[PDB]
């Protein structure tokens, strides 16, 4: 409750201002404070939470990849010893990234998921849970890499099961969940065939449902379908 003295509505207003100012760390802190008020989040508020943390962890992941690449080049044949600094700094960034992922997972566990009864909210939060375990898996190397991977898979799978029962195949959350689960298969689980099959089946089932949509919904769905197609083009 570092934001404990601020009104819920003011935290949401400030999160929107922080987004406009591209102050994503602030945005995430405001949205964490809003979640900790204990009320469920509306559709727009869930999007604000997700956008905030995706930007924060996205910057950390990009930095981790830069540093990991420098570190791997230093541990090659013919490389001059550079001292412990590259590893130490990569570790610092890695720990910070893990801390953000743990914070998001903690919000989902206390108590966003358990109070989420509608399909749109439950699928949204379970997709988030899969995504943040996936980010943990990207940097994992020790006794728990397998368990982290299984936690991501389990969250995505529960979200997929709900989305297939409760949402049309063009629903943008269902589409983005399938996109990200396919990326999990390709990049984390060493299952490129499963990634390709999921992306193809998702795209084809969405295509067959586009006729039911308004112009605005058609634009929303086809945008994500193009991302599935982009991945299929890279993978095949």
């Amino acid at each position: 409750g570092a934001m404990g003295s601020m009104e819920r509505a003011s935290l949401i207003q400030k999160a929107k201002l922080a987004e406009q100012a591209e102050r994503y760390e602030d945005m995430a802190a405001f949205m964490k404070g809003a979640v900790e008020k204990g009320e469920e989040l509306s559709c727009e508020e869930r999007n604000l939470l997700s956008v905030a943390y995706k930007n924060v962890v996205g910057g950390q992941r990009a930095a981790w990849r830069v540093l990991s690449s420098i570190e791997q080049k230093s541990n090659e044949e013919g490389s001059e010893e550079k001292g412990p600094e590259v590893r130490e700094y990569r570790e610092k960034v890695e720990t910070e990234l893990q801390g953000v992922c743990d914070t998001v997972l903690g919000l989902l566990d206390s108590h966003l998921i358990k109070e989420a009864g509608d399909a749109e909210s439950r699928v949204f939060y379970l997709k988030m849970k899969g995504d943040y375990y996936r980010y943990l898996a990207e940097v994992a190397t020790g006794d728990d890499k397998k368990r982290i991977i299984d936690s991501a898979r389990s969250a995505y799978q529960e979200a997929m099961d709900i989305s297939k029962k409760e949402m049309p195949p063009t629903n943008p959350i269902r589409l983005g969940l399938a996109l990200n689960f396919s990326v999990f298969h390709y990049e984390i689980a060493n299952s490129p065939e499963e990634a390709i099959s999921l992306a193809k089946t998702t795209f084809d089932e969405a295509m067959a449902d586009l006729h039911t949509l308004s112009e605005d919904s058609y634009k929303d769905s086809t945008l994500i379908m193009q991302l599935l197609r982009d991945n299929l083009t890279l993978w095949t």
Binding site: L48, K54, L179, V183, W235
Partner: peptide, 9 residues
């Protein structure tokens, strides 16, 4: 391979 960008509300 791209996940949902998801960085703009």
């Amino acid at each position: 391979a791209g996940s949902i960008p998801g960085r703009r509300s």
